[PDB]
């Protein structure tokens, strides 16, 4: 919807991908950067996005590269 020049990812997650893809599949990446986009470099890894009080594990599939990390991490619990 926005950010017409270049997708946004944080350096404390981007470099944490390239130390965790060439070294094999690793731990669920405990990250707080919901503001970052899903790049195709993380397809097939476990990511632990913070939703406010815990870290929900999300498995990055092939088709979520158009979205961001926080959209697969619901914040408010209803019923």
């Amino acid at each position: 919807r926005s950010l017409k020049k270049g997708p946004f990812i944080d350096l404390h997650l981007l470099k944490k991908v390239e130390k965790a893809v060439e070294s094999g599949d690793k731990k669920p990446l405990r990250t707080w950067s919901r503001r970052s986009t899903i790049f195709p470099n993380m397809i097939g890894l476990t990511i632990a996005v913070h939703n406010g009080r815990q870290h929900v594990p999300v498995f990055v599939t092939d088709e979520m590269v158009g979205h961001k990390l926080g959209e697969f991490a619901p914040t408010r619990t209803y019923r």
């Binding site: 599939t61 088709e63 979520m64 979205h67 959209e71 697969f72 619901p74």
Partner: protein, 114 residues
Amino acid sequence: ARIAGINIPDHKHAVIALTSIYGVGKTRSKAILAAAGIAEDVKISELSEGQIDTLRDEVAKFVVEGDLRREISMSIKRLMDLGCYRGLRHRRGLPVRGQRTKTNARTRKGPRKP
């Protein structure tokens, strides 16, 4: 007087009657018809079948009733199967673009329960 599957608007004007197709508003209909060269304020009862045939292939590039009803369903099938934020708002009948839900929320809910 048969375009893209039903299209049966008699004695309406040209750019107005074309918007009965699910897939075209007044902007595309004056863009579709200008690509075929017909004056836009003429009724379709005046149009002959030697002029309606130029309308049939021109509306075939912009997707219409048959597949446009399912491409917009392909997205909402995708989001509800993945489980994003907009998927769960689609899964529960709630507004998607972050509108107010405390008070109104009503054209998405429908009627009022109690």
